[PDB]
Amino acid sequence: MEAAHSKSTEECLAYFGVSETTGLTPDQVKRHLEKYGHNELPAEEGKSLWELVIEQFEDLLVRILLLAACISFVLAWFEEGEETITAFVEPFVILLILIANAIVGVWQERNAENAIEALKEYEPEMGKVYRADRKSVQRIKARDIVPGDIVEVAVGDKVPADIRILSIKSTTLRVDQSILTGESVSVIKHTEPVPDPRAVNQDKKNMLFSGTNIAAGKALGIVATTGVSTEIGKIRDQMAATEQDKTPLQQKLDEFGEQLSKVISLICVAVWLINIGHFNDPVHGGSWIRGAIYYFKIAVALAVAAIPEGLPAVITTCLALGTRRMAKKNAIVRSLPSVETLGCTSVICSDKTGTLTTNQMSVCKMFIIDKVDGDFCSLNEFSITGSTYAPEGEVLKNDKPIRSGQFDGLVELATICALCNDSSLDFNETKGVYEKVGEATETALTTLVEKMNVFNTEVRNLSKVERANACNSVIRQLMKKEFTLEFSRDRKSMSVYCSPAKSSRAAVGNKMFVKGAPEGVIDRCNYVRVGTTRVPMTGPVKEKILSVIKEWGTGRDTLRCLALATRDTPPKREEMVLDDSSRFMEYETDLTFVGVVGMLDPPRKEVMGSIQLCRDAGIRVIMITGDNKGTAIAICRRIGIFGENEEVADRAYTGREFDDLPLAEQREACRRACCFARVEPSHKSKIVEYLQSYDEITAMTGDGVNDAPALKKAEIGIAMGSGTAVAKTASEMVLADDNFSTIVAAVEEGRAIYNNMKQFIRYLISSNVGEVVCIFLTAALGLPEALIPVQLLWVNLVTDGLPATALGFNPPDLDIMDRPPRSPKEPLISGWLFFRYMAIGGYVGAATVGAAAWWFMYAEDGPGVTYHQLTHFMQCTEDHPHFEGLDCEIFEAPEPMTMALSVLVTIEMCNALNSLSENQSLMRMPPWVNIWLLGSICLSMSLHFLILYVDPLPMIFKLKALDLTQWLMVLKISLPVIGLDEILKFIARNYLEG
Ligand SMILES: C/C=C(/C)C(=O)O[C@@H]1C[C@H]2C(=C1C)[C@@H]1OC(=O)[C@@](C)(O)[C@@]1(O)[C@@H](OC(=O)CCCCCCCCCCC)C[C@]2(C)OC(C)=O
Ligand SMILES: [K+]
Ligand SMILES: [Mg+2]
């Protein structure tokens, strides 16, 4: 039963048909349980090693390798008895690759954490009900509570379900709904129904939300909803229904796999055609078994050559580094793949209070009425100093200090500020600072009181531990606070019924002290206190009052104002029902205005600039605040969301206005809006959807469990470090200092990261392109494998990885934050850059094949078969008399392979230098720009020699050191690459719209 809040205590007992005195019966219990199910959120997502591990082998690339590893394994164990036992080091390495990346995927995910799982931390294990099967209370398991049965809760207890309160046993019930609603201060509950059927949780004063805590009291109530139908359950459902897309890069990876898959097979078709003559050859002899082995060994090589096996390692090590780098700047990024999406954010929705402002209130101006006479009128504005809650400052009229006592209007303004106030101050030795006790806007008022001690009471003769609440406790012993009418958004105010202490003063006694939003409070005033006297509130004086409030809340001050009043002759105590906030506005009427106080929540230093950066970066910044409209705008101008004189009519909306619109304009408002005031949880999710309907990468801030649905729906959920853990676990990033600027600093790094990341990716991908061209030639000619999978792997993993990771530390462009947000759909390689790698690839594929074919033909160390189709090498033993008057093992020589392998290795180091910049020539951007790059190249080259000399290595890599004259052959073949590209870059920079 929803809406329980708008129903009466009786109607709820009626609906379920249960007795507040007996509690459901067992027949009612088991029946309700088969209709409402158990009181608990659904289980977890069932994924097992079998299932988990599978995916790790779902990726097309991985699939392709797994296959190749097999063909390899088969051949590897299907040749000579011991011609080279190392026949197995090929399939084994591939497997280790796949195996290792899987062990990564698994360990990776296992250390993840579900935001929905985090919700269960708010489910109590036990609960307390009164059922017919016993007169005394039973402490059962929460999971077994049902809609309708009578529940009992008290201090310390965590609410087990959404409960409609029946009767409060204590004198007051206080609940900590921080997580849901938000208000961190314990809020007061009642029993009377809330009219509005569509009331927001914050106003369901007669409800207990499952998951919240009883800060103070004991109550009895009936369970309205259970499990998934509770406020928090409704939230779990939204998060479960949320589906996150794949990072643009992750999409590009799948798309790239789908292609690489096609090209490969197309090459096979082509290759098969190139050697179609085999179908016009002898009907006997040859070797269908040897030619086959050949085409299969080409398959496996082709595959190893087409996939960037070192990329996974390079990409993660790059992100891991950035991550740590951002943490140093207070941006904790959980989910490495997010660093990217982060960088492309186009819109940022930020909560104001804790992140755009400091949330450290302080009163700057006061004002009481000085004189009313006819239509003449004169106020007594003031100004106050001190931005800290610290009791140190001065009050001033026209910048000139003053002793507040000389004014009676201030004597009262202060008393009201000290009595109608649930908060306070406290000094600590730990940090020697004065800390806010209750709430921020109230803890500021107690502070104001100290700074204007109306009575001049001595205090410099007091420490700081007592200086805290000194001038306040005086006013506290001057009146006796009978009771307080707590704040409610309907009347936008709160009051307190005090009664004079002793007879010493006993001045008319029983006074009512109210403080609230001006509009409301001033309307309920029929009088105005001028110092010590009273006069009837009149139109003139009213205008003069509202005006100053508008200038303080709209003007460049952007101050939040609080009207302060007193009800001189309040109703008789007996005639008041202190337990139905519905009658409180009635009690707070026929008031006399005593003064207003305007306080300020200061923007943070770094925020002003940060807002500017977003402008230059093409990132839209949307403020989400509580402050009423008009004032919200003021705040936006003050921080730069709006220009002091910039129009804002259509760029600012209130939760109401927005709801009042049709899906049509609701969506339109979102593309141009920049300020949302008096919002609501429902809105944050709606606002994201719209922003998304414009393919905008939006980041959203939040911190309570009520923000999690939206935090998880945005492209980047940003949680506050001081926020709940649920908020955190549902966001991709956490602000250690809750500072907005931290966000911008993070988006920047993101853009940086992607830029280098984008280079080394192009680099590795390009090398694969060439490696493949090589393999395509070696086989389209019918010549000996110039390159082996084992070597290719070593290169794609080790020799090329080092330079690739180095490219991760490439200097960041200085204009990063001056260009708009990168389009997610922008391809890593297309247009001219494509053609370049197309060509470069074509080059290394030739250099490598030719390099090895050179040591065969034109070599001084090996028998050069000159220009005689050395390809038919397949037929030597059988035809040792037709063009073969020499050995036949020369075709499996190590020299020709180390020849082609070394041209690759060096062409790669050259390419790793052509990758320091997409278009800038090496003369303009020299290799030394990135020390790491050069240094890594030495480790690569030497590591190359490591496998040419050290025993095990060469033997198993099919490599044998080459002399100082062959090496020069390498340099002559490879080095030119730097030139080929320099030319292509020149074409891009000059003869090309770039
Ligand atoms: C690979 C070997 C051979 C023999 C081959 O044939 O590669 C072809 C050629 C083509 C592509 C292939 C499939 C790609 O297919 C695509 O769909 C595109 C449009 O990606 C693609 O066209 C380009 O690659 C790219 O843009 C960058 C793709 C980057 C993919 C990985 C992104 C990062 C993944 C991160 C995961 C966390 C250009 C590319 C290669 O040609 C040239 C000259 O670069
Ligand atoms: K998200
Ligand atoms: Mg919140």
Short mmCIF file of C-alpha atoms in Angstrom, two decimals, residues 453-838:
data_model
loop_
_atom_site.label_atom_id
_atom_site.label_comp_id
_atom_site.label_asym_id
_atom_site.label_seq_id
_atom_site.Cartn_x
_atom_site.Cartn_y
_atom_site.Cartn_z
CA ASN A 453 26.80 40.59 22.15
CA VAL A 454 23.93 42.99 22.68
CA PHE A 455 24.74 43.25 26.38
CA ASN A 456 28.47 44.02 26.19
CA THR A 457 29.06 41.07 28.53
CA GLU A 458 32.78 40.53 29.31
CA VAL A 459 34.52 37.73 27.45
CA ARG A 460 38.16 38.54 26.49
CA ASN A 461 38.65 37.28 30.05
CA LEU A 462 37.57 33.87 28.71
CA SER A 463 39.24 31.06 26.76
CA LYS A 464 38.25 29.81 23.31
CA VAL A 465 36.55 26.63 24.58
CA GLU A 466 34.07 28.91 26.37
CA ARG A 467 34.24 31.88 24.00
CA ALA A 468 32.26 29.55 21.72
CA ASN A 469 28.74 29.86 23.20
CA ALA A 470 29.26 32.78 25.60
CA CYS A 471 26.97 35.63 24.46
CA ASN A 472 24.51 32.97 23.40
CA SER A 473 24.02 31.25 26.73
CA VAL A 474 23.26 34.66 28.24
CA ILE A 475 20.20 35.10 26.04
CA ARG A 476 19.42 31.46 26.78
CA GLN A 477 19.06 32.14 30.52
CA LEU A 478 17.06 35.30 29.84
CA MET A 479 14.14 33.32 28.43
CA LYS A 480 12.96 29.78 29.07
CA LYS A 481 12.38 27.88 25.82
CA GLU A 482 9.06 26.10 26.39
CA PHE A 483 8.83 24.37 23.01
CA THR A 484 9.74 24.74 19.31
CA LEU A 485 7.58 24.56 16.18
CA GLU A 486 10.00 22.86 13.78
CA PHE A 487 10.59 24.00 10.22
CA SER A 488 8.28 22.82 7.46
CA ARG A 489 8.46 23.73 3.79
CA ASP A 490 4.79 24.60 3.67
CA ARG A 491 5.24 27.68 5.86
CA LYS A 492 8.98 28.08 5.22
CA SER A 493 9.74 28.97 8.84
CA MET A 494 10.15 27.78 12.38
CA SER A 495 9.44 29.30 15.79
CA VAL A 496 9.80 28.86 19.50
CA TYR A 497 7.47 29.55 22.38
CA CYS A 498 9.58 30.90 25.25
CA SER A 499 8.54 32.01 28.71
CA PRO A 500 10.50 34.51 30.82
CA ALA A 501 12.69 33.09 33.55
CA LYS A 502 11.88 34.25 37.10
CA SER A 503 10.10 37.54 37.96
CA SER A 504 13.23 39.73 37.63
CA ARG A 505 11.94 40.64 34.16
CA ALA A 506 8.68 38.67 33.70
CA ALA A 507 7.92 41.21 30.95
CA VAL A 508 4.50 40.16 29.52
CA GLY A 509 6.15 36.75 29.16
CA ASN A 510 5.26 34.03 26.70
CA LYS A 511 6.75 35.37 23.52
CA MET A 512 6.96 33.52 20.22
CA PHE A 513 10.23 33.90 18.20
CA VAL A 514 9.95 33.13 14.46
CA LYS A 515 12.58 32.98 11.65
CA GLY A 516 11.93 31.98 8.03
CA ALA A 517 11.92 32.98 4.35
CA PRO A 518 10.94 36.69 4.12
CA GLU A 519 7.98 36.45 1.76
CA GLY A 520 6.14 34.09 4.07
CA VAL A 521 7.13 35.63 7.40
CA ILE A 522 6.61 39.27 6.35
CA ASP A 523 3.12 38.49 5.11
CA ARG A 524 2.13 37.21 8.53
CA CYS A 525 3.29 40.46 10.20
CA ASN A 526 0.77 43.12 11.22
CA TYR A 527 3.30 45.12 13.24
CA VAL A 528 6.94 46.27 13.09
CA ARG A 529 9.25 46.73 16.08
CA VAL A 530 10.96 50.15 15.97
CA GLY A 531 13.62 49.81 18.66
CA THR A 532 11.44 49.15 21.71
CA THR A 533 8.11 50.35 20.43
CA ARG A 534 5.65 48.77 17.97
CA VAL A 535 3.73 50.22 15.02
CA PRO A 536 1.21 48.85 12.54
CA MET A 537 2.79 47.29 9.46
CA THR A 538 1.91 49.48 6.48
CA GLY A 539 2.21 49.19 2.71
CA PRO A 540 5.06 51.74 2.52
CA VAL A 541 7.24 50.07 5.15
CA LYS A 542 6.49 46.70 3.56
CA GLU A 543 7.85 47.72 0.15
CA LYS A 544 10.97 49.24 1.61
CA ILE A 545 11.55 45.90 3.34
CA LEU A 546 10.99 43.54 0.44
CA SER A 547 13.16 45.76 -1.75
CA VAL A 548 16.27 45.53 0.44
CA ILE A 549 15.73 41.77 0.52
CA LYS A 550 15.63 41.65 -3.30
CA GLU A 551 18.78 43.78 -3.58
CA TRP A 552 20.58 41.46 -1.16
CA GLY A 553 19.41 38.25 -2.77
CA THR A 554 19.52 39.37 -6.39
CA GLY A 555 22.25 41.98 -6.21
CA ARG A 556 25.95 41.16 -6.59
CA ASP A 557 25.80 40.08 -2.95
CA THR A 558 23.76 36.95 -3.65
CA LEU A 559 22.87 36.69 0.03
CA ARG A 560 20.29 34.29 1.37
CA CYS A 561 17.93 36.26 3.64
CA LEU A 562 16.14 35.25 6.82
CA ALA A 563 13.29 37.40 8.15
CA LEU A 564 13.17 37.48 11.97
CA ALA A 565 9.95 38.19 13.89
CA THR A 566 8.17 37.74 17.22
CA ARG A 567 4.53 37.18 18.15
CA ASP A 568 4.06 39.51 21.13
CA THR A 569 0.84 38.02 22.45
CA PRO A 570 0.96 34.39 21.31
CA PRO A 571 -2.07 32.15 21.80
CA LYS A 572 -2.50 30.63 25.26
CA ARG A 573 -0.30 27.60 25.73
CA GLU A 574 -3.31 25.29 26.35
CA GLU A 575 -4.94 26.34 23.07
CA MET A 576 -2.04 24.97 20.99
CA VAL A 577 -1.74 21.45 19.55
CA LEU A 578 2.03 21.01 19.41
CA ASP A 579 1.84 17.86 17.23
CA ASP A 580 0.36 18.65 13.81
CA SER A 581 2.72 20.85 11.78
CA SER A 582 -0.44 21.79 9.88
CA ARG A 583 -1.51 24.25 12.58
CA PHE A 584 1.96 25.79 13.10
CA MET A 585 1.50 28.48 10.46
CA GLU A 586 -1.70 29.49 12.30
CA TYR A 587 0.25 29.91 15.56
CA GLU A 588 2.93 31.97 13.79
CA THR A 589 0.61 34.77 12.75
CA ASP A 590 -0.18 38.35 13.79
CA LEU A 591 3.55 38.89 14.05
CA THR A 592 5.71 41.96 14.43
CA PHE A 593 8.72 42.30 12.11
CA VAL A 594 11.97 42.79 14.00
CA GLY A 595 14.66 42.52 11.27
CA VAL A 596 16.36 40.45 8.56
CA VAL A 597 19.74 38.87 8.27
CA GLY A 598 21.48 38.14 4.98
CA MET A 599 24.12 35.45 4.95
CA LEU A 600 26.49 34.15 2.32
CA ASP A 601 27.69 30.78 1.13
CA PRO A 602 31.02 31.68 -0.56
CA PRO A 603 31.99 30.26 -3.98
CA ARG A 604 35.34 28.53 -3.85
CA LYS A 605 38.45 30.37 -5.06
CA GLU A 606 39.32 27.91 -7.85
CA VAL A 607 35.70 27.74 -9.09
CA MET A 608 35.68 31.06 -10.95
CA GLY A 609 38.57 30.07 -13.16
CA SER A 610 37.34 26.53 -13.58
CA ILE A 611 34.09 27.80 -14.98
CA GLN A 612 36.11 29.80 -17.53
CA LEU A 613 38.12 26.77 -18.62
CA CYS A 614 34.88 24.96 -19.50
CA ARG A 615 33.91 27.84 -21.75
CA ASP A 616 37.19 27.62 -23.60
CA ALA A 617 36.78 23.84 -23.66
CA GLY A 618 33.23 23.90 -25.06
CA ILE A 619 31.90 22.19 -21.91
CA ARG A 620 28.49 23.40 -20.67
CA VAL A 621 28.16 23.79 -16.88
CA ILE A 622 24.78 23.23 -15.25
CA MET A 623 24.22 24.23 -11.66
CA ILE A 624 21.77 22.27 -9.57
CA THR A 625 20.75 24.20 -6.43
CA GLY A 626 18.22 24.55 -3.63
CA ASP A 627 18.19 28.32 -3.42
CA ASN A 628 15.01 29.78 -4.88
CA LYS A 629 15.12 30.85 -8.53
CA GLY A 630 16.01 34.57 -8.64
CA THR A 631 18.88 34.00 -6.20
CA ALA A 632 20.12 30.90 -8.04
CA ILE A 633 20.64 33.08 -11.15
CA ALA A 634 22.57 35.64 -9.09
CA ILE A 635 24.88 32.86 -7.97
CA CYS A 636 25.38 31.80 -11.60
CA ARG A 637 26.46 35.27 -12.66
CA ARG A 638 28.74 35.58 -9.68
CA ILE A 639 30.58 32.41 -10.75
CA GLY A 640 30.37 32.95 -14.48
CA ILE A 641 27.62 30.58 -15.58
CA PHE A 642 25.80 33.71 -16.70
CA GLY A 643 27.10 37.14 -17.65
CA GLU A 644 26.24 39.94 -15.25
CA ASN A 645 23.90 41.37 -17.90
CA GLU A 646 23.43 38.25 -19.98
CA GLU A 647 19.81 37.26 -20.56
CA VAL A 648 18.66 34.15 -18.71
CA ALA A 649 14.89 33.96 -19.18
CA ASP A 650 15.07 30.56 -20.95
CA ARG A 651 18.31 29.29 -19.48
CA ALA A 652 17.07 28.88 -15.88
CA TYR A 653 14.28 26.68 -14.51
CA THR A 654 12.70 25.76 -11.21
CA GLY A 655 11.62 22.22 -10.45
CA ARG A 656 8.05 23.43 -10.71
CA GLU A 657 8.36 25.32 -14.01
CA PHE A 658 10.09 22.36 -15.58
CA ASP A 659 7.43 19.86 -14.51
CA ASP A 660 4.81 22.30 -15.76
CA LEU A 661 6.27 21.81 -19.25
CA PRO A 662 5.44 19.13 -21.83
CA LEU A 663 7.96 16.48 -22.87
CA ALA A 664 8.48 18.69 -25.93
CA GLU A 665 9.89 21.78 -24.17
CA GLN A 666 11.18 19.84 -21.20
CA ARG A 667 13.69 18.38 -23.67
CA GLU A 668 14.25 21.78 -25.29
CA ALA A 669 14.92 23.46 -21.95
CA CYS A 670 17.76 21.05 -21.29
CA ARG A 671 19.86 21.96 -24.36
CA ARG A 672 19.97 25.63 -23.40
CA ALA A 673 19.49 25.64 -19.63
CA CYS A 674 22.38 26.19 -17.25
CA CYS A 675 20.63 26.68 -13.89
CA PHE A 676 18.13 24.41 -12.09
CA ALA A 677 16.71 25.61 -8.76
CA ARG A 678 14.49 23.75 -6.29
CA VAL A 679 15.12 20.53 -8.17
CA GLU A 680 14.28 16.98 -7.13
CA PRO A 681 15.79 13.40 -7.54
CA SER A 682 13.32 12.61 -10.30
CA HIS A 683 14.71 15.56 -12.27
CA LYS A 684 18.37 14.66 -12.22
CA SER A 685 17.53 11.43 -14.05
CA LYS A 686 15.17 13.21 -16.45
CA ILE A 687 17.72 15.93 -17.15
CA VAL A 688 20.33 13.32 -18.00
CA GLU A 689 18.09 11.51 -20.47
CA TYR A 690 17.41 14.73 -22.32
CA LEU A 691 21.08 15.73 -22.37
CA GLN A 692 21.64 12.23 -23.79
CA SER A 693 19.00 12.68 -26.47
CA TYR A 694 21.50 15.19 -27.85
CA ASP A 695 24.30 12.65 -27.73
CA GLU A 696 26.00 14.72 -25.08
CA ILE A 697 28.53 13.12 -22.75
CA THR A 698 27.31 14.42 -19.43
CA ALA A 699 28.77 14.12 -15.93
CA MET A 700 26.46 14.40 -12.92
CA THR A 701 27.23 14.98 -9.22
CA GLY A 702 25.41 13.37 -6.30
CA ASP A 703 26.12 11.86 -2.85
CA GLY A 704 23.03 10.35 -1.32
CA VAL A 705 21.39 7.06 -2.19
CA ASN A 706 18.71 9.16 -3.82
CA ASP A 707 21.30 10.39 -6.34
CA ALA A 708 22.56 6.93 -7.27
CA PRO A 709 19.96 6.30 -9.96
CA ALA A 710 21.12 9.43 -11.80
CA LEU A 711 24.80 9.02 -10.93
CA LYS A 712 24.63 5.64 -12.61
CA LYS A 713 22.72 6.93 -15.58
CA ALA A 714 25.02 9.83 -16.46
CA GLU A 715 28.02 9.10 -18.68
CA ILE A 716 30.21 9.93 -15.71
CA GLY A 717 28.83 9.80 -12.23
CA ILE A 718 30.73 12.03 -9.87
CA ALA A 719 30.36 11.25 -6.17
CA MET A 720 31.47 13.38 -3.25
CA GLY A 721 34.33 12.05 -1.13
CA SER A 722 32.33 13.02 1.96
CA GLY A 723 29.27 11.32 0.43
CA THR A 724 27.66 7.96 1.07
CA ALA A 725 29.32 4.78 -0.14
CA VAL A 726 26.37 3.90 -2.30
CA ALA A 727 26.82 7.13 -4.23
CA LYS A 728 30.48 6.33 -4.55
CA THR A 729 30.07 2.78 -5.75
CA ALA A 730 27.69 3.96 -8.47
CA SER A 731 29.92 6.70 -9.79
CA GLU A 732 33.00 6.41 -12.02
CA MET A 733 34.82 9.09 -10.09
CA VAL A 734 35.00 10.45 -6.55
CA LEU A 735 35.93 14.02 -5.53
CA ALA A 736 38.24 13.65 -2.51
CA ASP A 737 37.72 17.33 -1.73
CA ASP A 738 34.19 17.63 -3.08
CA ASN A 739 35.56 20.53 -5.15
CA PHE A 740 34.10 21.30 -8.57
CA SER A 741 37.42 22.48 -9.85
CA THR A 742 38.68 18.94 -9.16
CA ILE A 743 36.27 17.80 -11.83
CA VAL A 744 37.61 20.16 -14.50
CA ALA A 745 41.18 19.23 -13.56
CA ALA A 746 40.12 15.63 -14.21
CA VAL A 747 38.44 16.24 -17.56
CA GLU A 748 41.65 17.91 -18.67
CA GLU A 749 43.90 14.98 -17.73
CA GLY A 750 41.41 12.82 -19.55
CA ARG A 751 41.88 14.77 -22.76
CA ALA A 752 45.65 14.57 -22.24
CA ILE A 753 45.65 10.85 -21.65
CA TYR A 754 43.55 10.14 -24.76
CA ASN A 755 45.88 12.18 -26.95
CA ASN A 756 49.01 10.14 -26.14
CA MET A 757 46.94 6.98 -25.88
CA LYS A 758 45.63 7.79 -29.38
CA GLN A 759 49.22 7.92 -30.65
CA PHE A 760 50.69 4.76 -29.29
CA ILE A 761 47.54 2.97 -30.48
CA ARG A 762 48.07 4.23 -34.02
CA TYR A 763 51.71 3.23 -33.72
CA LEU A 764 51.05 -0.36 -32.67
CA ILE A 765 48.14 -0.73 -35.05
CA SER A 766 50.28 0.53 -37.96
CA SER A 767 53.09 -1.93 -37.22
CA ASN A 768 50.52 -4.72 -37.34
CA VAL A 769 49.46 -3.46 -40.77
CA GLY A 770 53.01 -3.78 -42.05
CA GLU A 771 53.70 -7.10 -40.36
CA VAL A 772 50.71 -8.35 -42.26
CA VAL A 773 51.84 -6.98 -45.62
CA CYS A 774 55.05 -8.85 -45.11
CA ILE A 775 53.24 -12.15 -44.45
CA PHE A 776 51.00 -11.49 -47.45
CA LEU A 777 53.99 -11.13 -49.72
CA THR A 778 56.01 -14.03 -48.32
CA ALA A 779 53.02 -16.22 -49.29
CA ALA A 780 51.76 -14.44 -52.42
CA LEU A 781 55.19 -15.22 -53.84
CA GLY A 782 55.65 -18.68 -52.40
CA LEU A 783 58.96 -17.77 -50.75
CA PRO A 784 60.33 -18.73 -47.27
CA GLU A 785 58.74 -17.34 -44.12
CA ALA A 786 60.74 -14.20 -43.47
CA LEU A 787 59.10 -13.73 -40.05
CA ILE A 788 58.02 -16.21 -37.38
CA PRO A 789 55.07 -15.92 -34.93
CA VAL A 790 57.45 -16.25 -32.03
CA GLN A 791 59.42 -13.24 -33.21
CA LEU A 792 56.32 -11.25 -34.09
CA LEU A 793 54.98 -11.86 -30.58
CA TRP A 794 58.22 -10.75 -28.93
CA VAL A 795 58.07 -7.60 -31.00
CA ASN A 796 54.37 -6.84 -30.57
CA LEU A 797 54.71 -7.45 -26.88
CA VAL A 798 58.21 -6.36 -25.85
CA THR A 799 60.27 -4.33 -28.35
CA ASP A 800 57.23 -2.31 -29.48
CA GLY A 801 55.55 -2.12 -26.08
CA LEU A 802 58.36 -0.14 -24.47
CA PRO A 803 58.22 2.66 -27.10
CA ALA A 804 54.43 2.54 -27.04
CA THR A 805 54.23 3.06 -23.29
CA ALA A 806 56.82 5.83 -23.64
CA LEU A 807 54.49 7.54 -26.14
CA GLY A 808 52.09 7.60 -23.21
CA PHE A 809 54.21 10.35 -21.65
CA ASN A 810 54.19 12.58 -24.69
CA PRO A 811 54.08 16.31 -23.90
CA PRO A 812 50.45 17.52 -23.79
CA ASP A 813 49.34 20.13 -26.34
CA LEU A 814 49.13 23.57 -24.85
CA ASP A 815 45.79 24.18 -26.54
CA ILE A 816 44.04 21.15 -24.98
CA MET A 817 41.44 23.20 -23.11
CA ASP A 818 40.78 25.55 -26.01
CA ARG A 819 39.35 23.08 -28.46
CA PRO A 820 35.79 21.74 -28.05
CA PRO A 821 34.99 18.20 -26.72
CA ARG A 822 36.17 15.35 -28.90
CA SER A 823 33.45 13.64 -30.89
CA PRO A 824 33.15 9.99 -29.61
CA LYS A 825 32.43 8.80 -33.14
CA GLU A 826 35.75 10.20 -34.42
CA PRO A 827 37.79 7.29 -35.93
CA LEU A 828 41.33 6.61 -34.75
CA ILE A 829 42.40 6.18 -38.39
CA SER A 830 40.70 7.39 -41.59
CA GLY A 831 41.18 9.79 -44.48
CA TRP A 832 44.78 10.77 -45.16
CA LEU A 833 46.23 9.19 -42.01
CA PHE A 834 44.80 5.95 -43.28
CA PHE A 835 46.57 6.15 -46.59
CA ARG A 836 49.81 6.95 -44.77
CA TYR A 837 49.77 3.80 -42.66
CA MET A 838 48.42 2.09 -45.73
#
